[PDB]
Design an enzyme around this catalytic site. Structure first.
Site, mmCIF file in Angstrom:
data_model
loop_
_atom_site.group_PDB
_atom_site.id
_atom_site.type_symbol
_atom_site.label_atom_id
_atom_site.label_comp_id
_atom_site.label_asym_id
_atom_site.label_seq_id
_atom_site.Cartn_x
_atom_site.Cartn_y
_atom_site.Cartn_z
ATOM 1 N N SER A 132 50.584 37.656 42.977
ATOM 2 C CA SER A 132 49.882 37.243 44.218
ATOM 3 C C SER A 132 50.699 36.262 45.089
ATOM 4 O O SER A 132 50.425 36.196 46.332
ATOM 5 C CB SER A 132 48.564 36.651 43.882
ATOM 6 N N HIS A 147 45.249 42.309 41.856
ATOM 7 C CA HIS A 147 45.657 42.541 43.264
ATOM 8 C C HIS A 147 46.096 43.984 43.514
ATOM 9 O O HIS A 147 46.309 44.327 44.705
ATOM 10 C CB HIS A 147 46.745 41.533 43.653
ATOM 11 N N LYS A 193 38.000 41.023 44.085
ATOM 12 C CA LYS A 193 38.969 41.210 45.212
ATOM 13 C C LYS A 193 38.570 42.485 45.952
ATOM 14 O O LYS A 193 37.584 42.413 46.663
ATOM 15 C CB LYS A 193 40.394 41.147 44.645
HETATM 16 C C1 KPU Z 1 46.442 38.232 38.874
HETATM 17 C C2 KPU Z 1 45.115 37.623 38.643
HETATM 18 N N1 KPU Z 1 44.438 37.770 37.477
HETATM 19 C C3 KPU Z 1 43.229 37.247 37.237
HETATM 20 C C4 KPU Z 1 42.570 36.442 38.097
HETATM 21 C C5 KPU Z 1 41.219 35.889 37.716
HETATM 22 O O1 KPU Z 1 40.221 36.745 38.264
HETATM 23 P P1 KPU Z 1 38.814 36.112 38.817
HETATM 24 O O2 KPU Z 1 38.281 35.321 37.621
HETATM 25 O O3 KPU Z 1 37.982 37.291 39.149
HETATM 26 O O4 KPU Z 1 39.055 35.230 40.006
HETATM 27 C C6 KPU Z 1 43.200 36.183 39.394
HETATM 28 C C7 KPU Z 1 42.483 35.233 40.311
HETATM 29 N N2 KPU Z 1 43.098 35.074 41.603
HETATM 30 C C8 KPU Z 1 42.576 34.022 42.516
HETATM 31 C C9 KPU Z 1 41.145 33.487 42.258
HETATM 32 C C10 KPU Z 1 40.040 34.321 42.867
HETATM 33 O O5 KPU Z 1 40.011 35.622 42.418
HETATM 34 C C11 KPU Z 1 43.556 32.863 42.475
HETATM 35 O O6 KPU Z 1 44.357 32.686 41.482
HETATM 36 O O7 KPU Z 1 43.496 32.071 43.490
HETATM 37 C C12 KPU Z 1 44.537 36.737 39.661
HETATM 38 O O8 KPU Z 1 45.161 36.512 40.844
#
Ligand code: KPU
Ligand code: KPU
Lengths: 394, 394
Positions: free
Chosen positions: A184, A212, A243
């Site tokens: 990301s 992503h 997402k």
């Molecule tokens: C590659 C990957 N793997 C897992 C997650 C966790 O998923 P979540 O618990 O649904 O937010 C995220 C979470 N991404 C956002 C949080 C909102 O989804 C961040 O790190 O700001 C991520 O980018």
């Protein structure tokens, strides 16, 4: 008692300083649905800081599905999936996801984050190894830290380093490689062909975190294995619903025996309440729309290609993105905070990346596209970004 | 690749054996709202295996609040609270919770589980210590494992052991004691007066996990500190929304400076999507009802006192419960699986506790009360339990 605790938190002053300087822009309270424009302090703000890649959190069909599931099933299941927290609709969504990503079986988790804690904590144990790209998501490092295995980072997309570190390990040990599919920060894609080539040579399990990637790359958005044709070389496909899928929760899909092990051994599914009915139903209805209506993914990519072209044409220094994430380099923490707040105050929402998460000289704003963005919105945001970069002397 | 992975999961046969024997009763698919009766395979089943202590997942006011929040805010926030995932209603719920438990400030998490990972991972660090009751919830051991501190278990409610282990530690180190308020296995309450007495002597921070306490003990259900009058001796009150509060998510409340540190340093809030609007609104409306309508807590306890009396009168061997959790000892894993399935097949849902989570000789079923249970339902379930215990020769 608070003496030692007060000392532990005493040196954390950045938030105090940001707020005193009038630069603070974390936890901005939105008053409206997540959309291409959001209301903050009663004023409209263009949203380029979202993960809703297909704009589906406002889809009235998805809202109605969630509202109907509340009517039928109530507000919560009040238990682990393991015990009293499984609904017929959780199983339906698992079967749907398995079909979507081309695997035997899936298990849901109540967050994406817990979807990584589950397999990383309980498959590799004592005398085993987990190999992580150094840029992997925080949830993957945390999941790996909850295992009783030895956790080894390799250089970002560095296949020579991955191969070298695997070659050092005892033969009589199990190994698992876990990688983000789309990373990301810079929006880049894992070298899945070479990583799986190496995994095959060392008999290492492969897990891909497609947070992503789902709704973004692969056939009808099915993710990174789908994108490379490498379904058969990936043991575990992990995704999130927060997402593209416009909801909350996540899953791990794979072989029925592996998923049966997971669902009965992963603490993050045995000892945490199941997804709300509303979130199951919104995820189910979003997954139908992503597949049935190709226009969402098409429009996301037309926005991405347009915005990227416009940003490079105006002379912005972009990261090595392959995705709807356009990382714009600033290379000063102070200027990154200033640019973020000045854009906020001029009605543009972007996300800062600063030390200590990156070096000062790699500090950047993240500009993310949604399928529901218009070219007019993109142009207005870039116009404002050019002005603020000038004002801030980047 | 799957060679070593296949070997790792190869010896996990209990699920295969349970299913082949016709004893398997995990992940039972419910077809209806979580309530005192649930539909499984089209037939009605009495639910004594729930954490919805006040029966509020079916409250039409709470369903309507969730449905209205979906209408206004959509299906998800698509980001961390930190970035683009904060709504005015998250802040409203934080202010409400702070007032309820009598603390300056709160931060929400998207699960109860992540609400423990947050403070346990990021407050105590290198050269510091976390002291855990040996019966603490899995999420507390996992949170503590994510810290860079030294994690020390003490004997269950053993204040001599807690004091002895603290007395051994360097003075120039920070310490945190984390305990369940109500422990869910046996339904017992932490000795908060002695634990806080010891914490005060050693200047250790105190955190209480009130998952099973909120809506159950304390004034208007405000929890374990409220129950003992010890608000001023507890640094961090953690709760969940998945039980009395009929929803999904959790919080940590405490001093504004501590919570400001948490919300900007806990990976489980920086790197995980925020609570769905529907879950915020259901939690807000449930919290109003628990306080405004004293009958819910009253009826829960009238059910608890009745069922406990009836069970002891019929000669069941109960655990040392102080709560709506009635642990019924069986002391054979085989008989615990058999009794659980036979009750399921006769229309009673209870939860088994078996090895390796407990010794064979401590295996038991958990029978939990809801405020919405009737005396007639309790009597029918106990009638069926007496029959099945006879059939199973317990
Ligand atoms: C590659 C990957 N793997 C897992 C997650 C966790 O998923 P979540 O618990 O649904 O937010 C995220 C979470 N991404 C956002 C949080 C909102 O989804 C961040 O790190 O700001 C991520 O980018
Ligand atoms: C003391 C305590 N603390 C935290 C949690 C985690 O909260 P949850 O993520 O909302 O389920 C639980 C979760 N209890 C259930 C899961 C459903 O809430 C269980 O362990 O079966 C708990 O008992």
């Amino acid at each position: 008692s608070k003496g030692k605790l007060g000392e532990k938190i005493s040196q954390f002053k950045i938030v105090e300083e940001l707020k005193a300087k009038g630069l603070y822009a974390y936890f901005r309270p939105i008053q409206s649905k997540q959309d291409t424009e959001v209301k903050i302090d009663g004023r409209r703000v263009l949203m380029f800081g979202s993960n809703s890649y297909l704009g589906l959190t406002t889809d009235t069909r998805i809202i109605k599905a969630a509202q109907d599931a509340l009517e039928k099933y109530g507000t919560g299941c009040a238990g682990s999936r393991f015990l009293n927290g499984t609904l017929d609709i959780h199983v339906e969504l698992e079967e749907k996801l398995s079909a979507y990503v081309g695997k035997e079986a899936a298990i849901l988790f109540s967050t994406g984050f817990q979807s990584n804690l589950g397999p990383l904590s309980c498959l590799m144990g004592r005398n085993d190894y987990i190999l992580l790209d150094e840029r992997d998501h925080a949830s993957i490092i945390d999941g790996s830290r909850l295992s009783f295995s030895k956790v080894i980072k390799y250089g970002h997309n560095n296949m020579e380093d991955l191969r070298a570190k695997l070659s050092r390990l005892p033969e009589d040990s199990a190994k698992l490689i876990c990688t983000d599919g789309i990373f990301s920060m810079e929006g880049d894609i894992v070298n899945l062909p070479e990583l799986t080539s190496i995994a095959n040579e060392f008999d290492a399990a492969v897990m891909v975190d497609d947070a992503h990637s789902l709704g973004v790359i692969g056939h009808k958005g099915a993710g990174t294995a789908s994108h490379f044709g490498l379904n058969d070389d990936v043991d575990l496909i992990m995704g999130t619903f927060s997402k593209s899928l416009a909801s909350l929760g996540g899953f791990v899909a794979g072989d029925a025996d592996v998923i049966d092990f997971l669902k009965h051994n992963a603490r993050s599914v045995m000892f945490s309440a199941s997804m709300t009915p509303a979130s199951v139903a919104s995820t189910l209805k979003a997954l139908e729309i992503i597949q049935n209506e190709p226009e969402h993914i098409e429009k996301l990519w037309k926005n991405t290609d347009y915005a990227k072209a416009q940003l490079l044409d105006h002379g912005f220094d972009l990261g090595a993105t392959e995705s709807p994430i356009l990382p714009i380099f600033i290379r000063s923490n102070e200027k990154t905070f200033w640019v973020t707040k000045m854009l906020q105050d001029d009605g543009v929402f972007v996300n800062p990346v600063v030390s200590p998460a990156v070096p000062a000289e790699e500090s950047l704003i993240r500009f993310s596209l949604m399928a529901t963005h218009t070219y007019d919105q993109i142009d207005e945001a870039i116009e404002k970004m050019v002005k603020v970069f000038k004002q801030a002397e980047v």
